[PDB]
């Protein structure tokens, strides 16, 4: 249904500054607010947002309130200043999936059909992209409850924009691993990539924590993919993999050989262009 989401740096900071402006509460407050934007060509977009006044008590943590008058007036001001901009869903600050974040979506689903939530990060650290979005799916199914509803994570990324990149690259001024050559991919995905595979190997190990000791439901819907992985582990080295592999390596290194074969001659020509700049300058000038 929904392919993926588009998140901007403007909404990205536009949550964090609100976490700063309610950061004086000290004890506990989650930044929940209203997520604005479009979705076009089956691609979710997030352009604007604001935050709603919200409080919560730990005793009886099934009670939430959104001042929907404040939702009406300010979004009326936002449709007014920008008729193109509209609602796209909501968000909460999302450390660890708080429990009112099952009906916050069912509370305000009367505005957006796919009333999407976004989990953000307040203390930014990972080896990946700490931006999360779920989606609401419900099920009269299998065996958990006759009324069952659990969010499912749609893939999430930071959408860029030509307007905002002036501010992005303007406000970086720190470091930027450009000069995309033979080593950009080496570090963005060959150094960072295998350590990308590290945590994905680690998460199935975190599920493996229930061999006899973990939570009481066992598998049901985990083990078809698990059997599928070790079923679909790739082909071993006995056939033409090493052959045709040696064939195609044995063809790629031809092109490498030609490129290195030119490059030396080019730089040699350049040195001759220097010795003309030396020998007929030493006698001329002195």
């Amino acid at each position: 249904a929904v392919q993926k989401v588009v998140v901007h740096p403007l909404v990205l900071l536009s949550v964090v500054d609100h976490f700063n402006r309610i950061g004086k509460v000290g004890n506990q407050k989650r930044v929940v607010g209203v997520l604005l934007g479009s979705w076009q060509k089956k691609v979710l977009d997030v352009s604007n947002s604001f935050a709603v006044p919200f409080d919560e008590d730990d005793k009886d943590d099934s009670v939430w309130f959104l001042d929907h008058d404040y939702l009406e007036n300010m979004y009326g001001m936002f449709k007014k200043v920008n008729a193109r901009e509209r609602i796209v869903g909501w968000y909460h600050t999302g450390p660890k999936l708080h429990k009112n974040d099952i009906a916050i979506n069912e509370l305000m689903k009367r505005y957006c059909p796919n009333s999407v939530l976004v989990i953000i990060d307040v203390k930014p650290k990972d080896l990946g992209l700490p931006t999360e979005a779920y989606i609401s799916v419900e099920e009269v199914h299998d065996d958990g409850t006759p009324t069952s509803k659990t969010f499912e994570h749609v893939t999430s990324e930071i959408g860029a924009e030509e307007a905002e990149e002036v501010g992005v690259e303007h406000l970086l001024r720190d470091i930027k691993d450009t000069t995309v050559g033979t080593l950009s991919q080496r570090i963005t995905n060959q150094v960072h990539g295998l350590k990308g595979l590290n945590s994905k190997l680690l998460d199935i190990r975190s599920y493996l924590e229930k061999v006899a000791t973990g939570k009481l439901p066992i598998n049901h819907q985990i083990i078809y993919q698990l059997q599928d992985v070790f079923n679909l582990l790739p082909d071993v080295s006995l056939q033409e993999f090493v052959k045709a592999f040696y064939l195609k390596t044995n063809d790629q290194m031809v092109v490498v050989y030609l490129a290195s074969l030119i490059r030396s001659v080019v730089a040699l020509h350049n040195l001759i262009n220097n010795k003309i700049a030396n020998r007929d300058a030493e006698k001329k000038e002195g």
């Binding site: 943590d61 429990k99 993919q225 582990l233």
Partner: protein
């Protein structure tokens, strides 16, 4: 004028059939196959335009130009309430989907005739399309003993008498039905059969090794079924190319499927932890 000029100009094509002249018949029918958006009172007239279009498509080999012809004589709003004359309309709507040549138009045409409530009132002809839908067919002699007899039976005998009665066009339907049943073997034989002997296949076609080579020949020079036969060891095989690049190529395909697959579980585990170890 919408009706009377059309009634005038569709007359003389059967006169061209009395000439045995199809090259004129299709040109003067080219005037009227673009004559539509008049389906209000013309009950029998467009049906006469179709029944003078049974033969222009019936004569030479055109067993797939009769597709929209025969569903077009399923189309007409009168036919629905003359059930036994509509039973032979259930006949003509099935006596071509076999008979049409192998096509994507045939392979979704089985779905265009499939999923019908009032066609499956004949208990045989849901099974007939079921046979060419599903897996391996019971040769030909184990088939004609089960279905070469119901063509005389039922309330449906008349386009089956267009299969029976003419022994020459009818014989072309014995050998085109025979073409579909001898071909229906060869499709899934090439699909699942890596390397089979020649005698085993001539035995599963119930005929000679020589005529079996005639069957495999005109399809591999049609190159619609690629095969590398043998006439010294009888060891034939299907879809056996040299494959320099598809080994590592499809291996890379297995890599991408694998990385998608290991990506599939990773975002699925974390919510499974958070539904019993949330709070």
């Amino acid at each position: 004028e919408k009706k009377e000029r059309v009634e005038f100009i569709l007359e003389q094509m059967r006169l061209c059939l009395a000439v045995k002249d199809y090259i004129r018949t299709q040109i003067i029918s080219k005037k009227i196959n673009t004559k539509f958006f008049q389906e209000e009172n013309t009950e029998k007239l467009k049906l006469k335009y179709y029944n003078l279009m049974i033969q222009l498509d019936q004569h030479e080999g055109s067993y797939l130009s009769i597709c929209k012809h025969y569903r077009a004589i399923y189309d007409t709003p009168c036919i629905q309430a003359e059930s036994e004359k509509w039973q032979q309309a259930l006949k003509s709507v099935v006596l071509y989907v076999i008979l049409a040549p192998f096509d994507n138009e045939q392979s979704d045409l089985v779905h265009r005739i499939s999923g019908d409530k009032k066609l499956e009132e004949i208990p045989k002809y849901k099974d007939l399309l079921k046979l060419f839908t599903t897996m391996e067919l019971m040769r030909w002699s184990t088939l004609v003993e089960d279905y070469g007899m119901e063509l005389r039976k039922g309330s449906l005998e008349s386009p089956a008498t267009d299969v029976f009665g003419s022994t020459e066009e009818g014989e072309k339907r014995w050998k085109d039905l025979k073409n579909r049943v001898v071909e229906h073997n060869i499709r899934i034989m090439a699909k699942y059969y890596t390397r089979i002997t020649m005698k085993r296949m001539a035995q599963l076609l119930d005929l000679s090794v020589d005529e079996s080579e005639a069957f495999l020949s005109n399809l591999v020079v049609n190159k619609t079924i690629f095969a590398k036969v043998d006439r010294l060891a009888g060891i034939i095989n299907f879809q056996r190319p040299k494959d320099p690049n598809n080994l590592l190529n499809d291996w890379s395909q297995k890599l991408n499927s694998l990385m998608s697959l290991v990506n599939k579980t990773t975002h699925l585990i974390a919510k499974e932890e958070m539904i019993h170890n949330l709070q």
